[PDB]
Structure formats: structure tokens, C-alpha cells
Amino acid sequence: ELPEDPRWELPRDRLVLGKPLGEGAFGQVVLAEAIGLDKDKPNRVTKVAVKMLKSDATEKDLSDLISEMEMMKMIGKHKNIINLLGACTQDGPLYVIVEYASKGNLREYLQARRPPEEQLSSKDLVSCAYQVARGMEYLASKKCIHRDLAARNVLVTEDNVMKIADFGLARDIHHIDYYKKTTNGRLPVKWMAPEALFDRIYTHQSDVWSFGVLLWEIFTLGGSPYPGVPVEELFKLLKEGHRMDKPSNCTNELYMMMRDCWHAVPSQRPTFKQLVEDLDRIVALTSNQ
Template sequence: MLRLCKILCILLKVLMLTRTAITSSSKDQEAPIAQEWNKSSVIIDSNLIKSIEISTAQYLSYLYTYVPIILSLVFTFVICCIYYFYYSYQQRKENKIIVPSRLQYNLGELAMTIIEEQQIILGNLLGSGTFGQVFRGTLKNFERSDTPVAIKMLRKNASLKEKKKFLREAKLMNYFRHKHVLRLLGICVDTDSPMIMVLELMEAGDLLTYLTESRTLQPLHPHALRLQDLLAMCEDVARGCRYLEELHFVHRDLACRNCFISARNRENRIVKIGDFSLARNLYKEDCYRDKGEDPLPVRWMAPEFLMDGIFTSQSDVWAFGVLMWEIMSLGEQPYFSKNNSEVVQYVCTGGKLSKPLNCPPMLFQLMLHCWTAVNNRPNFIHCLENIITLRDNIEDAKLI
């Protein structure tokens, strides 16, 4: 740096002398010809010129030698920084769930509640699946009382991948605070026992079983379903779906089997959405492209998923249309006369479910709207508004 400053000073002196020479020459042209130019005043010392030439050559030599090295080091440093931050971002993305900015809850309220194994008393088995089993149980000393709960227990020989998925579902459910979304009370992660999710107990069980069992009830039975009951179920699920839509979450497995009933009497009956094992956070992404890791129920799947493996929030709207069809048919299997391969071909070529026997025409039009092309489907706010309007303008009736 010091050498560079010396070179710049020398060049500055040369420029000043040159400027003086040019100025003197201009004045001489205007003066009489007899006036002679004093050449000795602008003679530059030859030693100074040689010094400038040597210094410049050394500077250029250093420039050509060290600049490429410096640039390569800077480039390498930048690449390392980019890789480090990208790797850190991917690690954070895999190990924790990003809370959307629209979740306006105090972080203290969202902290995962850890439950000790001694607090849990297992009761009778309610159901089982590939993940493990669900039991009825009691949670001791929860909010100063013993609380009836549902115990979702991961199987003992679960793989590390299954344990991560189980914990991820618990983290997802912990963020939700809505009347029509199943509430997670806490988790138990003792190393010597299977992982456990403790959920609020829905006394009447899952919606699919509730609907199929209601077929056997006589019209005068106090728990017999009527048209307004079915519409109320559709409305409850739509409210829960609207909440998830506002948070930019998609469920990916909306179906009656994954919704739950709080009670059998209509005064206390509430439907809640549960089972978020397949849920995805779409707040940072436009869509989720499935990689074939999870077995997915094709009878509730939209054609864009069946053909291209693409799942968006609009794909949940398609599944909601199928769910409404299930409710109005009292739990019949969609496309019951076709096997899975035939269902895929039928849906991808534009096939639709037919109108259930007890379904009002206006509600069936909403179903058909849910089964249109992706860009033409309604959002859940529109679905909810239509269902509320229908409930307000249709008379209650017995089911046929």
C-alpha cells in the first residue's frame, strides 16, 4: 500500500509539470514570436521517468500475481457461506415446524406439554392402525382434575422414521386452537415406553362409524339422524377446514374416518377434524409433490394428484366434496362398485360421484363445484357460506 502511494505521488508530480508546460505553451502562442520558450523549465529528470517506469512495472507484476489469488479466496469464502446457511436452513426445516405468521398465539401457550407416564391410566382399546393403537384412558392431575382422554400410542418396534413422523404430527396438532379441530393435550416421550400422544376424548368416536351405525336406528329413536343433523356435520367440518386454510395448512386426508364426534345427542354434538399424520405446511411452498412414501387413499384424491402427484390446498377442497358425499350417504364407500385402479381411471377421465338419496340439490351442486378443475374450485370460505345459507333456507326432514 505504501509503495502504491509513492507511485501515485510521482504520477501526480508528472501531471502537474505537464499541465505547467501546456499552460506556458499556450501563453507563448499569444505573445510575440520573438519571445522564446524557456525549455529548461519543463525538462523532466530522466532518473524520475526511469523511477516511474520501474515502480509501475513492479505494481503491475504484483497486480497480476496476487489479485487472482485474492479473488479466488473471496469466491471460495462466499461459496462456503452460502453452503453453510443453506445447510442450516435445511436442518431447521427438517427438525422443527415453521409457525405461520398468521398464528397469533403467545409462544408460551404453544409450548408442548410433557406428560409423565405415571399420569396416564390406560382403558379399553378404541382402534388400531399401522402406527399403533388408540386407547380410552384417564389423565391424572391434568388442569387440577382427572380427565378422560384418548391415548394414541406408537407401536413398540417403530422405526426411527416412524417416531419422527409421530412427533411431527404432535407438533402440528399442538399449534391448532379451534373448536372444530381435535386438541392435543400433551405428549409422553419416556425412553423406556412407546411414544404417546394424549388427545381430548371424543365420546362418540369417529364420524364414519357414527354414520354407519345410525343406519340401524328407527326414525323415532332419540339419536336418529335428520337432514339438519347431516348439514350441521358438513358445516362443522367446513369451519375446521376454513381455519386450516387460513393457516395455509392442508390436511391431505380429509375423510369421515378422520373426523370425530363429541357426543351422540345433537345438543352437545360437535364434529372435529383429527389425524394429521399426512398434513403438510404449505405456508412457504406452493404445493406438495408426493414422493410415494405414504400409502394414500385414492377414493378421496383429486385428479391432479392421481395423475401428477401434485397436492395443493385445492386438493383438500376436492376431498371435502367427497366427505360431504359420505355424510349425506350415511357413510357409504365412495365409488363402492369400483376397485382402486378403476377409481383412478374413472376420476382421471372426469368421472364424478352420483347424488346421494337424501342430499339436497343445492348441496350436490356444491359437491360438483368441489370436483371441477383446480382453478375453478371454491375455497372453504365459499363452501362454508353455501352450507350456512342452505341450512337457513331448508326445512328439516327425516332421512329416507
């Protein structure tokens, strides 16, 4: 059995399980309604996402889900990350309950708003980047390295708030399969800094490289990096120092940002604290017209 933790325990009967949002292989995420999540409002329901372990799941799968939950407890709350809201741990299968993001991942959100029901100004796109940088600056401030920052791991709420997700996932790095694709058919190696990819060294500076690729995804409205490039050719591109071309409808100043994220020398990349401040000024100067 699992240890009881009254900071986070929600009685099982206060959770009304709904439809599946999809499955990992370790688990399954469902939409749910939580009744009386706040102590002050016991008669209010809150929509929430609920993680739980699929059927034929092992001890390793369990401990991995537990590690993720414990990490989110230590990291604390921020507007631009997916926050932990409670857990059902006792007398039945483990549920971890987190903030629900109604508008899906940022990649989907962006592709759905491409020119042909809703469109995005240049201010909105820069604001999107500012929010992800903020979440990242917070995460970094609590000593967390994401290791897979990408538009697909950013979620968007009903109020269009960007939230970093999957920042507490268990990795067991160097067991990563470079050939295996996302369900969308893309390859996660295309977001990884060369030091993380060749030498398996992960740092905040490598997450900054990943954030550059994310900026490029945002300004191409959800484009796919290096389309048609398989793993071995990607390796050759990185060795040669190739850098992705500037998206149309991206200012020079934002492209220079991406390129600074993609500095071959990790120490010379900007920090998330620096990116936050620059994006803050750029948002303010960018037209919504």
C-alpha cells in the first residue's frame, strides 16, 4: 500500500470519472469532476484531469507514477505549469489529479488556428512564448530540468493559459530510443541539444535549445521541424552546424532569439530569466493589429 498524505488526499467518492483523454503506455488520463476540492467550497465541482495506471501495469510503472507525483509536490504551484491538485492513494488504485487544460497541446492549438474558427495576432504568438518561458523560468528556479520541452508538452487552458506538462516524468535516460516516434509521427531527437543527444548531458542550457525549437514551432503555427529527415541525417546536420531557416512572419529579433537558443556553446545561450525579460519587452512592442 502507499503512505497516506493528508496535504493532497481527496476521498474517492468526491471524484466523478468521465471520458478518457487518451493513454500513455504506463497510464491513461481521464477527464473528471472533483467535488469540493477547495475546503471553502464543498458544493462546487471542478473539472480536472486524472492520471491512473493502466491494467497490466508493473511495480516499476507504479513507482514511476509515484515519483512524478512526489516531484510535483516538491515543485510547488505556478500559473504556467500543470499543477497537482490532489490524489486518491488509499483503498484502491492510484489516481493523481491535475489541472485540466481544455484546449489540448499547443501544437494542436496552433495548427487549428492557421489561416484557411479563431486566428492569432503577432502579439498572441509572442505572448504564448512569454508564458512558456515563464513556466520554464519557474521550473529552473526549483532545479527541475524538463528534458523534453516541445509544443506537444505544453497545454492550453480554456482561458488560453499555456501550461508546461510532463516536467516530472521519470526518464531513465540513455534507454531513450532515438528511432521511436510521437503518435503524430514526429521524432523527439529533433528538439534535443547536441550535447544531450551525443553525450547524454542534460542541463538548463539544453532545455533552452529545446525552447528555441519551440519558438520556431510557435512562429510556424505548429510546423514540424526537419520534415522528412531521419535520425542519421539529423545527426549529420547537427555535426555540420546546420540551423533551421527563419519562418515567414517572424521578426529578425525573434529569429535572432532562436538562433541564440541554438548557440553551439551551452554557456553562451541565454537563460530562461533573460528570455523572459526580452519576451516581456517584445510583447509590449508587438502589434495586435
